[PDB]
Amino acid sequence: SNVSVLQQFASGLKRAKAAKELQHYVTMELRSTRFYDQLNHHIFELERKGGILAIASLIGVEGGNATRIGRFANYLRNLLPSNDPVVMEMASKAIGRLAMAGDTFTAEYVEFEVKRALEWLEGRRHAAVLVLRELAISVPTFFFQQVQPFFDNIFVAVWDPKQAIREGAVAALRACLILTTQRWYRHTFEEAEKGFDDDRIHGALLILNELVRISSMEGERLREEMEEIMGFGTKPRHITPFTLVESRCCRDLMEEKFDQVCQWVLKCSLIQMTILNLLPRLAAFRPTQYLQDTMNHVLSCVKKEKERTAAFQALGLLSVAVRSEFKVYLPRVLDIIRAALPPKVDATVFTCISMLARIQQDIKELLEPMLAVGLSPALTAVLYDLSRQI
Prior knowledge:
1 chains; mainly alpha; globular
């Protein structure tokens, strides 16, 4: 559109921008190359979010080409060393899209990015970690090419005094350990124990919980399902239309976790959130001293604010994992729930009520307050699943 194209670009660069990007993608779906490249360069030089969106959309829709890859590789390599937050995540998403495009140069680009990330292992560390996460999720085959340097650099870079680096690197370790288990463990456990022996608290807990959760997926399945929250006998139409190491070290994991949960009770919110997330899975693997240590922190955080959602989720996972011994603290849980409802966040409360049901005739008397709370899709789903299971 030349003039109109440049106008639309300037408008998108200056909700509305998202709609503009969507319209551009829809237009590219139908559909000059030099004009498109010049427009991309004009948006790129000027703002950065619009340029990244345009580049990623055109690459994804028009299809990866050698000329396009060669021309946009320079832009991507210019964006990475220095940029602004949020824009960095969008650039990482564009990189992941280019990696998952599936071209000949994809292997070379992935190897280049992996080597640069390993050299790095702060707009450089976080971008490298995001790229590594995207490549591990998208291309496990080329992500497994470098494993020993990956672990060696990460086990040193993780324990640096940073927050976003920890959050990204924990997920990258999650992906790497899942890939390894599907197809190191001693080195990972040794590094986690050395780090554990307030910054070096949640990282070791996460590393140990990785082995615990990969060994036992039963606890993770419930959490994943709650985060998410025809027939074979039908006659087809007569006219067819056109168409081991994680088990022997899990004990030590729970041991190191039960102490860290009791120690870092209120040290440096983020640590409390991580402990609340990780304790229920550890208890699900192996439930009294561990159970008491978990329950103390869980009950302390439930009464407090800013953690009620995760604390209640951990409480529900504990109730599922521990059936008999958990019955002692049922009155406290019920009193806290009956206290939290009258203010009306409570959607997760209903979800955890469903998990606890996942029973007694006291639920008949509990029906009135939850119904009096109000309408919400989570409450409806909870009632439907309760009528299903029981």
